[PDB]
């Protein structure tokens, strides 16, 4: 899955 | 200023646990959008990720070393750690303690490493 | 995992030369927040990696104009536009968009003679 980045 | 300092055992042998700890300053990881995290390189090698702990306990880990790593904190005392069972010669490294934010302003990046702490996993 | 491929591996350059280093990632580096997570870091001997570009193309600050990155996608070049000892070492292209975070095996920026 997707790292954490906000937005 | 923000500083980050790793320590570790120094020698252990192979089949122990490596207990690692990360102290910092000048930042708090109770801080919403903060994180921090753990980087290793052996001698001559490269640079492969281990773990990442958020301010709010999510957990990011690895999957190849899921069955090794444990990332938690104490946000409190300005410290994270890193647990890795079960080492063996291969995990032999500098191990280094680096914070990263998932939100623009607080720096999405790795712009602060510490100076790393040398774990050398030998009988 | 993402696997992140830099060519060349060891590259020479005579000081004042331009060089450029590629990195090719196995798939799209942008994350569904629209920004790509492509970061470039030197590492020096006996000392920890220093952030030099993010986001593809943004210096970090400090980072002197002579360094520059370019891309999209899965396909991005670090540029230094004239080599100064004080560039040698060894440059990592990396993507923060997906776990597991990966590095490439790092290219080594040596002395021609």
């Known amino acids: 899955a997707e790292f954490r980045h906000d937005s | 200023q923000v500083t980050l300092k790793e320590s570790g055992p120094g020698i252990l042998k192979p089949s122990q646990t490596l207990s690692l700890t990360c102290s910092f300053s000048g930042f708090s990881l109770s801080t919403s959008g903060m994180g921090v995290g753990w980087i290793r390189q052996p001698s001559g090698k490269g640079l492969e990720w281990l773990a990442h702990i958020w301010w709010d306990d999510d957990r990011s880990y690895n999957p190849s070393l899921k069955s090794q790593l444990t990332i938690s904190k104490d946000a409190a005392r300005n410290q994270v750690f890193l647990r890795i069972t079960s080492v063996d010669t291969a995990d032999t490294a500098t191990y280094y303690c680096?914070?990263?934010?998932?939100?623009?302003?607080?720096?999405?990046?790795?712009?602060?490493w510490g100076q790393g702490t040398l774990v050398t996993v030998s009988a | 995992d993402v696997l992140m491929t830099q060519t060349p591996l060891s590259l020479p350059v005579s000081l004042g030369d331009q060089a450029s280093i590629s990195c090719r990632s196995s798939?799209?580096?942008?994350?569904?927040?629209?920004?790509?997570?492509l970061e470039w870091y030197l590492q020096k001997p006996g000392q920890s990696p220093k952030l030099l570009i993010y986001?593809?193309?943004n210096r970090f600050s400090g980072v002197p104009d002579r360094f520059s990155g370019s891309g999209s996608g899965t396909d991005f070049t670090l540029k230094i536009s004239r080599v100064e000892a004080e560039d040698l070492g060894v440059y990592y292209c990396?993507?923060?968009?997906?776990?597991?975070?990966?590095f490439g095996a790092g290219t080594k920026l040596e002395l021609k003679r």
């Open positions: 990396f993507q923060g968009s997906h776990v597991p975070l990966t």
């Open positions: 798939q799209s580096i942008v994350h569904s927040n629209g920004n790509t997570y």
């Open positions: 986001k593809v193309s």
């Open positions: 680096v914070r990263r934010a998932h939100t623009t302003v607080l720096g999405d990046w790795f712009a602060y």
